[PDB]
Amino acid sequence: RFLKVKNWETDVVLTDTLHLKSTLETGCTEHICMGSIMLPSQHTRVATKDQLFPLAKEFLDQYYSSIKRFGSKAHMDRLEEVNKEIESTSTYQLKDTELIYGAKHAWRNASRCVGRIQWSKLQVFDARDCTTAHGMFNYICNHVKYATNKGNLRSAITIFPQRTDGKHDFRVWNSQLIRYAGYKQPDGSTLGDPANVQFTEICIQQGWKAPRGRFDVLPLLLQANGNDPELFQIPPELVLEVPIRHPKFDWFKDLGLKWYGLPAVSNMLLEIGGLEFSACPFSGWYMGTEIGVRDYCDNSRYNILEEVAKKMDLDMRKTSSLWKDQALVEINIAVLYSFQSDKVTIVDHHSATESFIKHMENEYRCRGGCPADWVWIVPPMSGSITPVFHQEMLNYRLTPSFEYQPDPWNTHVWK
């Protein structure tokens, strides 16, 4: 009942009691493991009043347990206070203090996140007073500006008002606030970013006028209080981009690539004490592999191993010349280099995996465990030369949490 995880590079052993507080299910049963299914029906996100008080209760009991007032009159009164508001309006509202707590712990509990060492250093912007798509654009712009901080990136989250009835719903329709457009061509091939070609279309549907190129920063599509979403373009001066050069190959400039400094995931759902925030964009800084490995080299993303290997003059006949591997290490040295020569915050996959282990240490010491998803923590290149390859991680789902949710244009009862 008090499980043990081992590291096989260091012969280090930690004990995990934190999983006893766990609540949600994981997809796995006694007779099957779903640890590699992408979006289980568990990780995807309508709640009633009887269901709501336990969740409000359980969350408040840990929030007061964490300020050294577990069970006092401050705790009890707030328990009755929300119990009362839950009678009155069937739902309730979070204190400013409870929002910062819940927010930070959704990150802290995010088992697929390698960078959680920074979870307490998080900036919470309360956008619960927002009412229009224009209001959302203004909060989101102030977020971009703040988190970007001149490439000295800072973590932040902006929390639009919680889902209520369920049809009056705030959503950012973009996957990330900053993403390049994706355009199909005549021959079927794809200019820009193949990932977003669906979204680019709905953008031009609603009225976007695309500069049909590669690294076209998409506009924002903002849905407010259930209304139909509206297009807004972030000021270009607030979209910090990094041109990708290499510290050897002078043709790497002619490759012509660039990426945005700020990764800002916007399309997911923040759960706090049983309340659902459908729009809650959060940002940090990039790990180099997210761009150099996945973005640039996924077959169905930018797919540049073709072109890079060419310029390197590479044995591209044989599969086993390892030319793909060769051009991937070069591509990732260049992303890191380019980002660092511009003083834009980036972390290499070795630094970040080492910290996640140092992080795992503190989570097991001062918290009794740390949920972690190996499939997603291991960087997607040079896996076993990073230290997390050899660390056993127990995955389990605590709360407060971040949950996937269906895309709006599928669910949105239009016009």
Ligand X SMILES: Cc1cc(N)nc(COc2cc(CCN3CCC[C@H](F)C3)cc(F)c2F)c1
Ligand Y SMILES: C[C@H](O)[C@H](O)[C@H]1CNc2nc(N)[nH]c(=O)c2N1
Residues forming contacts to ligand X in the complex (CB under 6 A) are: 263, 265, 268, 282-287, 290
CB nearer to Zn ion: give 28 or 255: 28
Residue 160 counted as an annotated binding residue:
no
Geometric angle at alpha carbon 352, from 348 and 358, rounded to 5°? 155
Choose among 343, 400, 290, 350: nearest CA to 66.
400
From the list 60-68, 132-140, 185-193, 346-354, the region that binds its own copies by CB under 8 A is: 346-354
d(CA 221, CA 273): 28
| Ramachandran angles phi, psi of 7, nearest 5° | -105, 135
Catalytic: 45?
Answer: no
Instruction: Pick out residues in 10-69 that bind Zn ion (CB under 5 A).
Output: 28, 33, 35
For residue 17, give both structure tokens.
Answer: 């009691």
Q: Is 386 in the site for ligand HEM (CB under 6 A)?
A: no
**Per-residue interface string for the shown chain with its own copies, residues 375-394, x marking contact by CB under 8 A:** x--xxxxxxxx---x--xxx
Stretch that binds ligand HEM, among 14-22, 213-221, 235-243, 279-287 (CB under 6 A): 279-287
Cβ(170)–Cβ(267) below 8 Å: no
Q: Supply the minimum distance, in Å, between the C-beta of residue 111 and ligand HEM.
A: 7
User: In sequence order, what are the residues at sequence separation of 6 or more whose Cβ sits closer than 8 angstroms to the Cβ of residue 92?
Assistant: 52, 56, 82, 85, 86, 275
Q: Torsion angle of alpha carbons 34, 38, 40, 41, nearest 10°? A: -160
Q: Does 115 bind ligand HEM (CB under 6 A)?
A: yes
Decide if residue 6 touches its own copies (CB under 8 A): yes
Residue 389 marked ligand-binding:
yes
Measured in degrees and rounded to the nearest 5, phi and psi for residue 338 equal: -55, -45
From the list 360, 359, 356, 364, the residue with the least C-alpha distance to 386 is 356
302 is in an annotated binding site: no
**Which residue out of 98, 271, 276, 290 is catalytically annotated?**
290
DSSP state at residue 18: G
**Is 116 an active-site residue?**
yes
Residue ranges that bind its own copies, judged by CB under 8 A? 3, 5-6, 8-9, 19, 22-38, 288, 293-294, 297-300, 305, 319-322, 324-326, 328-329, 332-333, 336, 340, 348, 350-351, 374-375, 378-385, 389, 392-396
Residue ranges that bind ligand HEM, judged by CB under 6 A? 43, 107, 110, 112-115, 118, 155, 157, 282, 284-285, 287, 290, 347, 352, 376, 402
